[PDB]
Amino acid sequence: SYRVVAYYISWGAYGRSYFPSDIDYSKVTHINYAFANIKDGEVVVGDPGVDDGGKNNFTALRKAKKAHPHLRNLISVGGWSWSSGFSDAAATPEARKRFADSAVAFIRKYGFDGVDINWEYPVEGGAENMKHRPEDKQNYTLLTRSLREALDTAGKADGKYYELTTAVWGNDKFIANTEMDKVSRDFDFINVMSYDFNGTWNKFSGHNAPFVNDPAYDKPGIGKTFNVVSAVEAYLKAGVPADKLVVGVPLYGYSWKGCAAGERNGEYQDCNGKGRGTWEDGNLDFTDIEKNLLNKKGFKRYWNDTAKAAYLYNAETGEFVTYEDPQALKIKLDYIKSKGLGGAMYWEITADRKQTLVNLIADELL
Numbered sequence: 605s606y607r608v609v610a611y612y613i614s615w616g617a618y619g620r621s622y623f624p625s626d627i628d629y630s631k632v633t634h635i636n637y638a639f640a641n642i643k644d645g646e647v648v649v650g651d652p653g654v655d656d657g658g659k660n661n662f663t664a665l666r667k668a669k670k671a672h673p674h675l676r677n678l679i680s681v682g683g684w685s686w687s688s689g690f691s692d693a694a695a696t697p698e699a700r701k702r703f704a705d706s707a708v709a710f711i712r713k714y715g716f717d718g719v720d721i722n723w724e725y726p727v728e729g730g731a732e733n734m735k736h737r738p739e740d741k742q743n744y745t746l747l748t749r750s751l752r753e754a755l756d757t758a759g760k761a762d763g764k765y766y767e768l769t770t771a772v773w774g775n776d777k778f779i780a781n782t783e784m785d786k787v788s789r790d791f792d793f794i795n796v797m798s799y800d801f802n803g804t805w806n807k808f809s810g811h812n813a814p815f816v817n818d819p820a821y822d823k824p825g826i827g828k829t830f831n832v833v834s835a836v837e838a839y840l841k842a843g844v845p846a847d848k849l850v851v852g853v854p855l856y857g858y859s860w861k862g863c864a865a866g867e868r869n870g871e872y873q874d875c876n877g878k879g880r881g882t883w884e885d886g887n888l889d890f891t892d893i894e895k896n897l898l899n900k901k902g903f904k905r906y907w908n909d910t911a912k913a914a915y916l917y918n919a920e921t922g923e924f925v926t927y928e929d930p931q932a933l934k935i936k937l938d939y940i941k942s943k944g945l946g947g948a949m950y951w952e953i954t955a956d957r958k959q960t961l962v963n964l965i966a967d968e969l970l
């Protein structure tokens with residue numbers, strides 16, 4: 605009934621040493637492979653060393669399909685760092701044909717069941733390398749159309765339905781910059797990234813995915829709609845049908861160091877930059893939190909009963925971790941069911957080796 609949409613990261617097959625063979629396929633409905641890049645207006649292999657060569661993640665995904673006929677694997681075109689190719693691809697029917705045809709070619713060659721458009725983001729926002737024009741607002745609708753048509757035609761040729769999905773911003777600027785009411789008709793479902801609301805881009809600490817607005821959080825330029833319920837509600841009002849709205853969830857945490865304690869054990873306080881991380885500073889796998897920090901080694905867990913968010917604080921180093929606690933994830937899973945939504949999505953599956961969050965979502969939606 606409900607979808608469970610796991611992002612798998614290609615670079616999992618390096619240091620992390622977590623491959624598609626390590627996935628518990630019984631615990632999901634979709635795998636979105638992060639990522640395919642864009643080169644010359646064409647969807648291309650992101651990493652020949654682990655995608656279609658070397659560790660051969662694509663082979664391993666096809667082996668998984670055979671074992672689990674019900675499974676659907678999708679290729680996620682773009683991501684934070686590889687979105688700069690979208691503006692061009694979208695802006696002419698010629699370039700849109702070129703793109704959509706390349707995307708059909710990609711999924712037939714590597715045995716994928718469809719495409720996830722991860723464009724970050726139309727009109728404005730994204731990485732230092734990212735490209736925009738204002739016509740992205742309409743062009744996003746146009747590109748979606750070409751893809752829908754090419755996937756539908758190629759689907760009919762191959763005796764196969766090819767899904768089309770997208771990942772959309774938690775910031776409602778995304779909605780003012782697209783036609784979600786138009787483009788919602790062409791997507792099988794929509795992956796709402798209802799996380800990255802607060803991070804080390806801020807000098808002060810906050811929650812990565814608070815459930816509702818905390819008015820006690822008033823640090824400069826953070827919107828009262830930077831929460832999970834505001835974003836879902838903004839996407840229902842913008843025209844995303846409930847049953848197509850998939851709720852994003854993070855399996856990583858963010859950390860700062862040197863956060864003043866104030867009267868909130870570190871919450872919404874000025875800090876001294878990035879805290880400890882797993883694979884890089886200030887970004888923690890839930891596995892790392894669970895095993896090494898969760899009420900351990902000077903880190904204590906606090907609960908905000910306005911936001912419905914947990915955080916750790918180390919009073920000694922003034923380190924503050926925002927992470928997805930089971931207590932908050934359960935409130936989000938009840939919300940999904942009560943609002944009639946499309947299911948849960950999460951970034952990303954290698955970050956929870958014990959499957960503590962992964963099992964709670966599977967057990968609640970499947």
Ligand SMILES: CC(=O)N[C@@H]1[C@@H](O)[C@H](O[C@@H]2O[C@H](CO)[C@@H](O)[C@H](O)[C@H]2NC(C)=O)[C@@H](CO)O[C@H]1O
Nearest residue numbers: 683684724773774775797800801802803805830
């Ligand atoms: C509320 C808001 O708009 N926050 C912005 C963040 O979304 C953004 O972080 C980026 O979020 C993306 C999902 O929307 C991720 O794909 C991406 O990895 C992430 N970027 C980083 C560096 O982690 C940040 C970027 O600075 O800006 C916020 O204002």
